[PDB]
């Protein structure tokens, strides 16, 4: 009964869920109403974060702490980061369906000690999520941003371009938080998003700026990361 045509979301969901069970021992339940993550592309981003935050010798090994902005119903970045690397995550969500599924997915995989799923107000991002945080420095923030039109026949094109305004909000919050987080990062869907974002960091005098390209056959993605550390 499960479709063999990989253009059908039922086949993409079955493949994601099977891959996670077989390769990572992670059993997840996700709705067809929400974005279905593709594991290879999610892994590329986790590995890029490993490289950014640096390697530790046994004597200097610590618990790494990260924030996932918009964790989705799958809670895919925290589930992978926690399972593969033992990383701690603060995983945020504004969507109620996504929040319930993410919380349930963390519980069914007994990862509540490493992943804290939180429902945040729609107007909030990083600043509010870290309300009066003065005990720890987070190693990273990561984000697969939503496609909001403004926040018609060209609604899709408009929604895709809404990625730029969402990343600009992460940049805005980073200018206030600064060294509270070591690396700020975001995944980009369009190559044309990179140039205006790099320029916005340059004019704001952000000392460290880096970027990469993730490729999974047909699908091409970019990621941008920045830091206030010298
Ligand atoms: N301000 C905000 N804070 C937290 N989550 C937000 C948000 N605005 C939107 N979101 C959520 O961000 C998500 C973007 S889709 C990315 C889902 C997941 N990280 C993946 O890679 O598959 C959506 O689930 C949306 O509800």
Numbering used by the authors: 41 to 191, 213 to 291
From the paper:
Two constructs (core, 1–291 aa; and ΔN, 40–291 aa) encompassing the methyltransferase domain (MTase) were expressed in E. coli and crystallized (Star Methods). To our surprise, even though the ΔN-truncated version (40–291 aa) has a similar conformation in terms of the Rossmann fold and catalytic residues, it was inactive. The complexed byproduct of the SAM-dependent methylation reaction, S-adenosyl homocysteine (SAH), is coordinated by a hydrogen bond interaction network with the highly conserved amino acid residues R82, D108, G110, T111, S114, E133, Q162, N184, and R230. The catalytic residues NPPF (184–187 aa) are present in a loop positioned in close proximity to the SAH molecule. While 20 residues between Q191 and T212 are not visible in the ΔN structure, a much larger region (35 residues) between F187 and G223 lacks density in the core structure. Third, the ΔN structure reveals the presence of two sulfate ions (SO42-), one of which is next to R82 (one of the residues coordinating SAH), likely mimicking how an RNA substrate might access the catalytic pocket. Crucially, R82 and R282, that are centrally located close to the SAH molecule itself, coordinate one of the negatively charged sulfate ions (SO42-) that we found in the ΔN structure, potentially mimicking how an RNA substrate might position itself on the enzyme. Given that the METTL16-ΔN domain is inactive as an MTase, we examined whether it can bind RNA substrates using UV crosslinking experiments. Incubation of METTL16-FL with a body-labeled MAT2A hp 1 RNA gave an RNA-protein crosslink consistent with RNA binding, while the ΔN version did not reveal such an interaction. This aligns with the observed lack of methylation activity of the ΔN protein when the same RNA substrate was used.
METTL16 is the second m6A methyltransferase identified, and its known substrates include U6 snRNA and the human MAT2A mRNA that encodes for S-adenosylmethionine (SAM) synthetase (Pendleton et al., 2017). Here we describe the crystal structure of human METTL16 to reveal a methyltransferase domain furnished with an extra N-terminal module, which together form a deep-cut groove that is essential for RNA binding. Consistent with the SAM-dependent methyltransferase activity of METTL16, both structures reveal a Rossmann fold composed of a central seven-stranded β sheet (strands β3–β9) flanked by three α helices each (helices α4–α6 and α7–α9). In contrast, we show here that METTL16 is active as a monomer, and it contains a large deep-cut groove that can accommodate structured RNAs.
